[PDB]
Amino acid sequence: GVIDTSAVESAITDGQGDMKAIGGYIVGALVILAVAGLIYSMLRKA
Amino acid sequence: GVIDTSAVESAITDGQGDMKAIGGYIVGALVILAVAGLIYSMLRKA
Amino acid sequence: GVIDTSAVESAITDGQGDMKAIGGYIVGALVILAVAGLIYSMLRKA
Amino acid sequence: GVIDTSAVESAITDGQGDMKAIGGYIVGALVILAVAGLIYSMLRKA
Amino acid sequence: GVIDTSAVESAITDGQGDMKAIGGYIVGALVILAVAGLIYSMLRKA
Amino acid sequence: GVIDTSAVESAITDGQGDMKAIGGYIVGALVILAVAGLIYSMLRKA
Amino acid sequence: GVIDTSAVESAITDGQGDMKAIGGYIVGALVILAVAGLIYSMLRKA
Amino acid sequence: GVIDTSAVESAITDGQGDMKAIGGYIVGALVILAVAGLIYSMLRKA
Amino acid sequence: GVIDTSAVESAITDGQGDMKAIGGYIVGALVILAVAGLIYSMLRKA
Amino acid sequence: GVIDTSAVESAITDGQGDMKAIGGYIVGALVILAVAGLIYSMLRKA
Amino acid sequence: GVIDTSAVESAITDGQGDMKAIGGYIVGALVILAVAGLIYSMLRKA
Amino acid sequence: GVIDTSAVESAITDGQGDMKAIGGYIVGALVILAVAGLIYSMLRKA
Amino acid sequence: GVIDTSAVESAITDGQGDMKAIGGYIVGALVILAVAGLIYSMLRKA
Amino acid sequence: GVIDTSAVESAITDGQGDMKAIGGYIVGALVILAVAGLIYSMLRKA
Amino acid sequence: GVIDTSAVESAITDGQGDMKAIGGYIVGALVILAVAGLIYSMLRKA
Amino acid sequence: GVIDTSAVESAITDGQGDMKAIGGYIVGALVILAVAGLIYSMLRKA
Amino acid sequence: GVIDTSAVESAITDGQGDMKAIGGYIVGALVILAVAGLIYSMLRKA
Amino acid sequence: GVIDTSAVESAITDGQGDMKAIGGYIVGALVILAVAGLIYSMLRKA
Amino acid sequence: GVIDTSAVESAITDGQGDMKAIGGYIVGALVILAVAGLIYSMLRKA
Amino acid sequence: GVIDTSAVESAITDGQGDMKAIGGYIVGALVILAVAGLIYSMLRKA
Amino acid sequence: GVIDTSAVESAITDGQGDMKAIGGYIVGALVILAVAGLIYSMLRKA
Amino acid sequence: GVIDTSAVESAITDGQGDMKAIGGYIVGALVILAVAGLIYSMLRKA
Amino acid sequence: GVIDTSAVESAITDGQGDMKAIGGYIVGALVILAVAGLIYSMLRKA
Amino acid sequence: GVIDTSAVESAITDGQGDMKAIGGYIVGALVILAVAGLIYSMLRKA
Amino acid sequence: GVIDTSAVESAITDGQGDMKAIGGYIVGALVILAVAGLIYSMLRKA
Amino acid sequence: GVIDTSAVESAITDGQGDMKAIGGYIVGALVILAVAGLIYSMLRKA
Amino acid sequence: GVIDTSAVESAITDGQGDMKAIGGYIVGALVILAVAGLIYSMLRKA
Amino acid sequence: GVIDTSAVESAITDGQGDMKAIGGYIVGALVILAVAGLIYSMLRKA
Amino acid sequence: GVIDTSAVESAITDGQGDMKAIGGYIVGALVILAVAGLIYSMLRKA
Amino acid sequence: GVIDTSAVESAITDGQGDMKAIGGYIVGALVILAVAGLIYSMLRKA
Amino acid sequence: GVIDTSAVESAITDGQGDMKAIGGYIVGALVILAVAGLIYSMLRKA
Amino acid sequence: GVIDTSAVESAITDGQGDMKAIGGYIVGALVILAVAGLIYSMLRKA
Amino acid sequence: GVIDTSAVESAITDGQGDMKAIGGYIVGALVILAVAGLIYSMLRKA
Amino acid sequence: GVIDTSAVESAITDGQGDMKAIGGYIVGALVILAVAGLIYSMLRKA
Amino acid sequence: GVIDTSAVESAITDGQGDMKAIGGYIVGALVILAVAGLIYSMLRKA
């Protein structure tokens, strides 16, 4: 006896991709703050 | 004299398979909660 | 004098076999309750 | 004088055999009740 | 002299068959109680 | 005068043996009910 | 002599089928609780 | 000689039908307990 | 000399038929007790 | 010669009806126990 | 012969209604626990 | 001939009323357990 | 010649009525045991 | 001729009263078991 | 005939009061758990 | 004629007192389980 | 002519009293079994 | 005439004492089951 | 026949009120946690 | 012989619908907690 | 057969309103934190 | 019947006071953080 | 008849005191977490 | 007559002590969970 | 023998879809918090 | 006359010792469940 | 004239002793069943 | 004149011994039934 | 005169040993149920 | 005399083996519930 | 007389070892949850 | 006697592997949150 | 009578040690989270 | 009756000391962050 | 008795290593933020 978490092991990875996937998009929006913030300073400083 | 639980011994195993079998499917649904929950956190955190 | 329960002694055994025999079948049905009951719990627990 | 119950003494035994003989057969039928009764209980109990 | 219980010996067996015969039918009805009772439990337990 | 129940005294014992003898066999069948009944409970309980 | 529980042996199986049969349906209802319960958690967790 | 339990054999079956018949109705009431009990749990669990 | 119990021998059988005959009817009534008693248990057990 | 148990044969049936008749009423009372008992459980279980 | 459980068959249903009837009321009380419990969480969560 | 269980038939019903009558009161006490038990849970849950 | 058991034939019936008569009353008392016994069980079971 | 069971008929009823009478008292003691048992459960359940 | 469960009917109520009575006290102790538990949370949360 | 169950009527009550008496003590022990169980929960919950 | 069973008629009653008398005492002992048996159950049940 | 069951009346009571006497001891053993059973639950519950 | 759960139906509602009633008070205490918690945050945040 | 759980099989489904039915409504209330909770965070976060 | 959760279905909605209702008030208090927090920053920033 | 949660209703309030009471003290300590934090900033800013 | 839960009523209160008693001590330990946690923040914030 | 449960009354108390006794020890182990759990939180929180 | 959880296996998947389905919608609402929060920062930072 | 249950009285006690004796050992095994169960919780909680 | 049953009166008592004597021994064996039966229950219950 | 039943008086006693003698042996066989019967019960009960 | 149940007295004891003897073995099998049952719970609980 | 339960003693053991034997298999199925349950928690917790 | 539960006493211990034995293994699996859970937190926290 | 949990001991380990196995995968997904979160901060901070 | 939980009292303590023992090790692992978390902050803050 | 949580009351304090004790050490590490952070600012500011 | 958490004690440490191990790697990534952040300032400041 045991418990066949055969497909359910690899199933974990199914969601994982999603975990790596969502980040890119948020992090892509995050990037504006790094631009705009330096722009925000740019126009005072430069 | 005795009592011939000959086939009834191995009969126990007949159901057992079922016992190991059902788990995989529930545990396969359980896995969503581990994905979605980390997704639920992902979108706040990441 | 005495009373010749010669064959009637061994006759007892004739029925006996029947006594051991019926049990297996009932006990074979009993076994469902041990499966189904754990299945009944399986689907809540697992 | 006396009364010659010479053969009539041993004659008693002639019938006797019959007395021991009939019993076996009835007692052989009696035995069903000991089987069936335990069978009658068997199917409720076992 | 004696007493010719010649046919009356084997006569005992005539009824006997009847003795074995009736049992099967009652015991066949008995069997419902073993089914229904486990069914009675089945629907609570399973 | 008296009545010579000399052999007929010990004759009583002839049948007696039979009385002790039959019991063992029935009691040997009785024993199934003690097994099967605990088996009947075993499969629900254990 | 004996006791002809010939058909009554196989008769046991007649009810048995019923014993295996009822379970599926209850266990099919049981399954909602495994869905709904994870749904009940899903909507808080996910 | 014998004893004509000719019709009385099949007579056993007359009652039997009744034996199978009553069960359905009780078992039909039993079924509420399997519904209501899961409903009883449903409203806490789901 | 002798005593002509010629017809009176076979006469015994005349009554006998009656002896086998009455039984069927009583035994046919007896059968209710085997039905009703199991019905009496049926409605508690099943 | 014989013995005219002509009407007394069918007489057996006169009482029989009574034998089938009384049962219905008791068995009709028995039925409460099957209701009330499940009601007794109903109010704890449901 | 047989046993007239004619009305006693349908009698089973008489109690049944009661079996379906009581449930609604308990289950109607059960429902508070599903409200109050979510209210109990509502006031912490929302 | 027969046996006049004329009034004794309907007599069965005399007791019956009692059979239906007692239940209400016990079942009325049973109901506390369904209240108190949900109250017992109420004060933890709600 | 013969023997005039003319009135003595029908006389048998005179007592008979008594035979059918007494039964009703005893059987009417018997009925309490069928009520009280089910009442005896009622108060534990229901 | 006949047999004057005139007073002895109604005599049956003399005892009967006693038959109905004793029951009340036992059944009155029975009732404790229905209270105490629910009390026995009350203190665990409520 | 019948069975005088006259006082034994109302007797049921005698115990009942007890059934309603015990609950208040347990439920009064239950209430601490609803206070202390919220106190247990109070000191972390507030 | 009758049967003088004069003192034996009231005798029933003699035992009854005992029936009410024993309960208090058991029910007094039962009460620990209601304390300790809530204590058992108290120390986790509070 | 006749036969003067004048005093012997009423003599019957002399013994009768005894017949009613002995019962009370046995029935008074019987009553323990109704107490003790319910006590025997009391200590398990209550 | 009559029958002098003078001492034999009171003799009934001689045995009676024994009837009340044995009970105490069994009932004293019964009491363990009420302790141990609550102990059996105590160690799981408390 | 049936079982008169006439008042016992509406009896369910008697307890129900209690079920709705207790909640308000607990939920009224719950509300502090929603105030104090926001107060707990208020004094850091505002 | 067997046991006609013909309608009682499909009867299981009768309750089932109820099992799927109740969930929707609770789960529909559950959904508030997913809104309000994100609203609860919304007003701090956004 | 089935289980009449007719009103108990719509009953779910009764509580629901409450579920939507409480939120508004808490969320109305939540809003202070969004004002005060920006006020808390306002007085440093502006 | 019902369940007298008469004092146990108002009992809820007993704990409540405690619920309002503890908060003041914690919230009184919370206040330091609002002082010290602005002091922590004061000494850099002012 | 009734059941003398006279002392067993007030007995409930015996344990209760214990129920109120244990809380103070745990809640007294709980208080550290409210100090230390604000201390934990104090040293970062102040 | 009666039944001398004289010592068996006080016997109940013999076990009782045991009932109060075992609890202390379990409850003494329970206490670790209240320490360790707050320690488990202590090291994250403080 | 075994237990035909044939359709009930695949039945698990029926609910599963629902499990994957609900998430998308919540996670779609979650996304606002990732926008608004960065907007909340955007207007201070940019 | 009487019945010398002289030694048979004290004989009751012979078995009793056994009754007290077996319990200790089972109750000693019971104790593991109280340890292991708290250990089972210990490793999650602590 | 009369009949000198002088010694034969007291002779009755000679056998009597035997009547009281045999009982003790059987009743001494009976006692095992009261031990073993409670032992039989002991090992399941305790 | 008279009739010299001198030796014939004491002769009566010659047979008597035989009368006391035979009993022991039968009664010795009787005893098996008291053993076996309790054994017959032993194996079901114990 | 009397009846020499001299050896037949002690004969009672011959069977007795058997009565004490059989119990040990059954009770030895009983013990599995006390192990397995706690094992049955062990694997869920521990 | 005695009763030769010579083989029937050791016969008890024949069934016993069966008693120890069946357990292993059920307990082997039980084990899934200990795995799956921790798996059921694993996927939420880990 | 008594009942030789000599080996059956120590027999209890045979199973006990098993009771202590199984725990270690489950508790050894339990330990993962204490690792993984802190790992689950580790990767967010550390 | 004992209970052969020979393979069932090592069986525990069968599931265990699964317990260690699932964690790696979840913990592997957990790791994104530790990356993305520091990335989420990276793009503001760096 | 009583129940010798003499060693079983102190037995409780046997497990207890284990209860205090396991905690240290978990709490020793807990401590990393208090280090690493402050390290996690250290490297941003310091 | 009551429950002797005599030592278990003061036992609470045993752990408490530990609760006050651990804090000092963590809070002693916390202090670095208050130094280093001001040092971190010191080297830019001063 | 006790519970052999012999290896399971040291087992705790098995995971621990993992607990110390993961930190280094995260903390190694944390370090970038301390570099980059000072670099982020470096290029404005220096």
Residues from chain L contacting residue N42 (CB–CB below 8 Å): 32-33, 36
Residues of chain L whose beta carbon is less than 8 angstroms from a beta carbon of chain N are 26, 29-30, 32-33, 36-37, 39-40
- b/e code L18-41 from CB counts within 10 Å (16+ = b): bbbbbbbbbbbbbbbbbbbbbbbb
- Tell me how far apart the alpha carbons of residues Y1 and C29 are, in angstroms, rounded to a whole number: 8
The correct answer on CATH 1.20.5.230 for the domain covering V1-46 is: yes
Give residues with Cβ within 8 angstroms of W9, minimum separation 6: O21, O22, O25
Best of G33, G42, G43, G44 to mutate (most B CBs within 10 Å, chain B):
G42
Give residues with Cβ within 8 angstroms of Z11, minimum separation 6: AA28, AA31, AE1
The full DSSP string for O1-46 is -----HHHHHHHHHHHHHHHHHHHHHHHHHHHHHHHHHHHHHHHH-
Q: How far is B36 from chain Y (nearest CA, A)?
A: 7
- Tell me how far apart the alpha carbons of residues A15 and B38 are, in angstroms, rounded to a whole number: 9
State residue E19 phi and psi, 5-degree precision.
-60, -40
Six-digit token string for Y4: 């035909």
Query: Which member of R19, R20, R42 has the closest CB to residue X19?
Result: R42
Residues from chain B contacting residue AF36 (CB–CB below 8 Å): 42, 45-46
Six-digit token string for Y16: 């599963």
Q: How far is P18 from chain N (nearest CA, A)?
A: 10
Q: Angle P6-45/N6-45 helices, nearest 10 degrees? A: 10
- Tell me how far apart the alpha carbons of residues E12 and D19 are, in angstroms, rounded to a whole number: 14
Count Cβ–Cβ pairs < 8 Å, chain Z vs chain AI.
10
CB distance AA42–R30 less than 8 Å? no
Chains AA and B touch (3+ CB pairs under 8 A): no
SS3 helix, strand, coil % of chain G, rounded to 5? 85, 0, 15
Give residues with Cβ within 8 angstroms of L16, minimum separation 6: J25, J28, J29, J32, M35, S1
Residue of chain AH with shortest Cα separation from AG28: AH22
Six-digit token string for G23: 């379970």
CB distance AG18–AI5 less than 8 Å? yes
CB distance AI15–AE36 less than 8 Å? yes
Among H31, S9, H35, residue whose Cα is nearest residue K25:
S9
State residue U23 phi and psi, 5-degree precision.
-50, -50
Residues from chain R contacting residue P33 (CB–CB below 8 Å): 38, 41-42, 45-46
- Tell me how far apart the alpha carbons of residues AG18 and AG22 are, in angstroms, rounded to a whole number: 6
Best of B12, B16, B27, B38 to mutate (most AF CBs within 10 Å, chain AF):
B38
Q: Angle Y6-45/G6-45 helices, nearest 10 degrees? A: 0
Residue of chain K with shortest Cα separation from J46: K23
- List the subunits that have 3+ CB pairs under 8 angstroms with P: N, O, Q, R, W, X, AH
CB distance O1–L14 less than 8 Å? yes
- Tell me how far apart the alpha carbons of residues Y33 and S18 are, in angstroms, rounded to a whole number: 42
Residues of chain B whose beta carbon is less than 8 angstroms from a beta carbon of chain F are 1-3, 5
Q: How far lies X2's CA from each of H36, K20, Q42, in Å?
A: 46, 46, 15
- List the subunits that have 3+ CB pairs under 8 angstroms with AG: R, X, Z, AE, AH, AI
CB distance S46–U30 less than 8 Å? no
Is-contact AE12 AG8, C-beta < 8 A? no
- Tell me how far apart the alpha carbons of residues D43 and G12 are, in angstroms, rounded to a whole number: 10
Count Cβ–Cβ pairs < 8 Å, chain P vs chain R.
21
CB distance G3–D31 less than 8 Å? no
Q: How far is AE16 from chain AC (nearest CA, A)?
A: 7
To one decimal, the resolution in angstroms is 3.1
Query: Which member of E26, E40, E44 has the closest CB to residue H12?
Result: E26
Residues of chain AC whose beta carbon is less than 8 angstroms from a beta carbon of chain AB are 1-8, 11-12, 14-16, 18-19, 22-23, 26-27
Is-contact G36 C44, C-beta < 8 A? no
Q: How far is AD21 from chain AC (nearest CA, A)?
A: 10
* DSSP assigned state of R4: -
Q: Where are the domains of chain W?
A: 1-46
- List the subunits that have 3+ CB pairs under 8 angstroms with E: C, D, G, H, I, T
CB distance R45–P37 less than 8 Å? yes
* DSSP assigned state of H10: H
Among AA21, AD11, AD7, AE1, residue whose Cα is nearest residue AC16:
AE1
Burial of H41 (0-12, 13-18, 19+ CB in 10 A): middle
Q: How far is X30 from chain Z (nearest CA, A)?
A: 8
Chains I and Q touch (3+ CB pairs under 8 A): no
Is-contact G31 C43, C-beta < 8 A? yes
Is-contact AH16 W29, C-beta < 8 A? yes
Query: Which member of L11, L14, L19 has the closest CB to residue M42?
Result: L19
Among K2, D35, K12, residue whose Cα is nearest residue H23:
K12
Q: How far is P33 from chain W (nearest CA, A)?
A: 10
Chains AH and L touch (3+ CB pairs under 8 A): no
Burial of J12 (0-12, 13-18, 19+ CB in 10 A): middle
- b/e code N28-38 from CB counts within 10 Å (16+ = b): bbbbbbbbbbb
Residue position matching structure tokens 């049955």: AC40
Q: Angle O6-45/V6-45 helices, nearest 10 degrees? A: 0
Q: How far lies R20's CA from each of G33, P17, Q40, in Å?
A: 56, 15, 13
Is-contact AD16 AC28, C-beta < 8 A? yes
Count Cβ–Cβ pairs < 8 Å, chain P vs chain W.
50
Six-digit token string for Z26: 């089972």
Residues from chain P contacting residue W5 (CB–CB below 8 Å): 24, 27
Is-contact L16 J29, C-beta < 8 A? yes
Query: Which member of B26, B29, B36 has the closest CB to residue G45?
Result: B36
Is-contact H18 T1, C-beta < 8 A? no
The full DSSP string for K12-33 is HHHHHHHHHHHHHHHHHHHHHH
Residues of chain G whose beta carbon is less than 8 angstroms from a beta carbon of chain E are 1-8, 11-12, 14-16, 18-19, 22-23, 26-27
Residues from chain Z contacting residue AI3 (CB–CB below 8 Å): 32, 35-36, 39
SS3 helix, strand, coil % of chain D, rounded to 5? 85, 0, 15
Query: Which member of P20, P24, P43 has the closest CB to residue W1?
Result: P20
- Tell me how far apart the alpha carbons of residues L44 and M31 are, in angstroms, rounded to a whole number: 51
Q: Angle AF6-45/AI6-45 helices, nearest 10 degrees? A: 10
Is-contact V3 O24, C-beta < 8 A? yes
Is-contact B27 A2, C-beta < 8 A? no
- Tell me how far apart the alpha carbons of residues AG26 and B16 are, in angstroms, rounded to a whole number: 35
CB distance AD32–B19 less than 8 Å? yes
CB distance H28–T15 less than 8 Å? no
Residues from chain B contacting residue AD18 (CB–CB below 8 Å): 2-3, 5
Residue of chain A with shortest Cα separation from AD29: A1
Is-contact R46 W15, C-beta < 8 A? no
Give residues with Cβ within 8 angstroms of L19, minimum separation 6: J29, J32, J33, M35, M38, M39, M42, S1
Residues of chain AG whose beta carbon is less than 8 angstroms from a beta carbon of chain AH are 34-35, 38, 41-42, 45-46
Is-contact T30 K39, C-beta < 8 A? no
- Tell me how far apart the alpha carbons of residues O3 and M40 are, in angstroms, rounded to a whole number: 12
- Tell me how far apart the alpha carbons of residues Y22 and J17 are, in angstroms, rounded to a whole number: 67
Among A36, AI31, A16, residue whose Cα is nearest residue AF43:
A36
Six-digit token string for X46: 């403080």
CA AE37, distance to chain mean position in Å, is 21
* DSSP assigned state of A2: -
The full DSSP string for Q1-46 is -----HHHHHHHHHHHHHHHHHHHHHHHHHHHHHHHHHHHHHHHH-
CA AI16, distance to chain mean position in Å, is 11
Which run of H or E residues covers position V15?
helix V6-45
CB distance R44–Z31 less than 8 Å? no
Six-digit token string for L15: 């007791």
Chains E and B touch (3+ CB pairs under 8 A): no
Six-digit token string for O39: 């106190």
Identify residue AE25 by its one-letter amino acid code: Y
Residues from chain P contacting residue R39 (CB–CB below 8 Å): none
